[PDB]
Design a protein around this ligand. Structure first.
Ligand code: NAD
Ligand code: NAD
Lengths: 383, 391
């Protein structure tokens, strides 16, 4: 089979020779009991840079040893990219959400041998699910691999916005002190109302981490949590996302991108937010109407916006989120820390082994299979 | 009496006429039961900028109406400063740790009328306590006013350093993407070992906040926590700070600055740290040898250093921590968010009313009283002078 794997470039100064530390912390399983990936073997050492072109997700030996072809490229956008040229006869397409090879309807029609589109991370919205269902393409992703890594990134961003960290670091770096200039836009998080749109793997990890900060917790989801869990975390349930907005100081988005959530944050829904509210979005860029968010920071409606996800990716040089007022943006990296890479590289291999060996792909990993949504796809998406 | 109050300058664009939000969250007391400040009244609206020269900690009406002269200035350094000139006959000196009026042995000796040195914030190390003790000056601070504010800043800073937030933000703002450049130095915090030097009000607030991150928690302190707390947070106790360093991925310093802690992080103790360790210091700058920390980052012994505290304050323009590799520094702001200012501005007024009315100053606020360390000062400090090099 031909495996076409789209990865990001290596660091500008080359593939790293050394790393900052010698080992990675050890984790046994994910919260709730799902086990870490179970490939028969791995050809890398956890901690190495695996999502860049030279890392190849540690898959070359395994594939070539089994008679497959592995094509690795970072050139993915447009009609003349290596990705589009190589796609026509690829049997398996792999890309990461951080540097995604978008599988539009037009690209899936041209990919005449396509049988599996694998996401090396979580979030398969860069793949047209309906064309995959119509073409019988299996769509799978590495469920839970970086859900905790993103939760950490959310808490970090929330505190950063509220405490005015970014601008204050600039003053230090530039030779100032200027305490008043740093703190006239700075508050403590303590006792603020924080709401999450979805309480899935990421959303629930965020809520647990925020609990000791003594904030008031709110949530909404397609799937309401058991009352006993709501009681344990002191959560207030909201049946709709619009009912939640008005009472929150901070809103964090942790739902997938699908037809029901696309453009949920827009000029109309932004009017439901209190003046000086904060939005953190590490889920997907398209959950927000781009210009409406910028207009809300320019007008003082929002006191801050931070996230690591944008639309499209890579974001254009001039994307307005890069420079709008009080932004705490990063390029898409929360789910691609070196720790996380080791887990999804291992799960990408487990899924390929199953797939080539004719064994079932875990259900938790499936998004689309055999002409319909399946497993996590049925739980969390909509076509 | 004459009250000499040193505050930081107003914003470069003027004293704000508007704020980002309409209210502040309401809190009832501090963790463990301590009540918030109880001045008889407050002449400000919580949420306003109070620690700057035009904010005056909301004290002018109260003081002038009671017969006291309030001299407010940001000019605090050197012998030709307004502060130095006015100090000779001030009865009461007020300063905040973020823009500290150093009361060195020399200044205390010239301050013929000084009776009370009040810290509008927490941390009185900018005052020579031995000289205060010698001269019978009362030293008081607004205990607990920003311990939670600071514990939030520590968690923020631990995450930023580990996840390599700052350099990543620079890439986004400059027009880049460069995923590999951002994550070649980024890890998840989950399951790392995190240790705190001291488990007081900030330290313990820090430990409670890190627990759900699933990290292994370690600590050391002059005063051991109760077994149920240790049990509840699954803490590992270390008799010495030198026993704890070696097993930690991240070390956060949360003790006061005094002779026993001054320069605890230096070229020799840095050698006990694992390679790629992180240090967060929002306590005091002088707990660390300045150049030793910069060398450790340059050499790779340390994978990050972040804090908001420096020595002296303000830090010189060329202070090395401003530009060393992998730093997550800010000027001294954690304890002076708009939220914390309302609490210490209220607490400063409560101590003054007590002082002037001949009512007892809360024991929890006392550092030095009647010729000796007293209240919180006997609990958390050791006597000496930490103001050397303040100039
Ligand atoms: N920034 C990053 O690196 C990164 C990394 C991982 C995931 N993510 C994003 O976060 C999403 C969530 O990840 P996860 O691991 O928590 O997944 P998950 O499937 O466990 O959780 C998603 C939750 O969203 C809820 N949901 C679905 N539709 C909804 C709707 N219309 N309204 C409200 N809630 C709805 C589901 O019921 C579920 O509880 C991913 O799909 C991806 O888009 C981003
Ligand atoms: N960045 C800022 O805004 C800011 C704000 C407030 C306080 N601080 C600093 O943090 C310090 C701690 O504040 P807090 O509210 O926790 O005070 P606290 O008195 O409640 O905590 C101090 C803890 O340090 C412990 N300790 C004392 N000497 C020690 C030693 N030699 N070794 C190890 N532990 C020792 C004490 O036993 C006590 O548990 C303040 O003194 C100040 O220096 C910084």
């Amino acid at each position: 089979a031909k495996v076409l794997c789209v990865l990001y470039d290596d660091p500008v100064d080359g593939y790293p020779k050394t790393y900052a530390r010698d080992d990675l912390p050890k984790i046994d399983h994910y919260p709730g009991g799902q086990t870490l990936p179970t490939p028969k073997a791995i050809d890398f050492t956890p901690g190495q840079l695996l999502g860049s072109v030279s890392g190849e997700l540690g898959l070359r030996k395994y594939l070539e040893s089994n008679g497959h072809t592995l094509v690795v490229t970072s050139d993915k956008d447009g009609p003349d990219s290596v990705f589009e040229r190589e796609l026509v006869d690829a049997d398996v397409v792999i890309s990461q959400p951080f540097w995604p090879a978008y599988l539009t309807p037009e690209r899936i029609a041209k990919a005449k041998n396509l049988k599996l589109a694998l996401t090396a991370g979580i979030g398969s919205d860069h793949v047209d699910l309906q064309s995959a269902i119509d073409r019988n393409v299996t769509v799978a992703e590495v469920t839970y691999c970086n859900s905790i890594s993103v939760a950490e990134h959310v808490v970090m961003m929330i505190l950063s916005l509220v405490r005015n960290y970014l601008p204050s670091h600039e003053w230090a770096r530039k030779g100032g002190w200027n305490i008043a200039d740093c703190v006239s836009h700075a508050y403590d998080l303590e006792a603020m109302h924080v709401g999450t749109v979805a309480a899935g793997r990421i959303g629930l990890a965020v809520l647990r981490r925020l609990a000791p900060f003594d904030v008031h917790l709110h949530y909404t989801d397609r799937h309401r949590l058991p009352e006993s869990v709501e009681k344990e975390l002191n959560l207030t349930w909201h049946a709709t996302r619009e009912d939640m907005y008005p009472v929150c100081d901070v809103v964090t988005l942790n739902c997938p991108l699908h037809p029901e959530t696309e453009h949920m944050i827009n000029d109309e829904t932004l009017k439901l937010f209190k003046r000086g509210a904060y939005i953190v979005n590490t889920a997907r860029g398209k959950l927000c109407d781009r210009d409406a968010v910028a207009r809300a920071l320019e007008s003082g409606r929002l006191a801050g916006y931070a996230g690591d996800v944008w639309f499209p990716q890579p974001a254009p040089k001039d994307h307005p989120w890069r420079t709008m007022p009080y932004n705490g943006m990063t390029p898409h990296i929360s789910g691609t820390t070196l720790t996380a890479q080791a887990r999804y590289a291992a799960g990408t291999r487990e899924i390929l082994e199953c797939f080539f060996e004719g064994r079932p792909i875990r259900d938790e990993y499936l998004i689309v299979q055999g002409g319909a949504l399946a497993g996590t796809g049925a739980h969390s998406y909509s076509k």
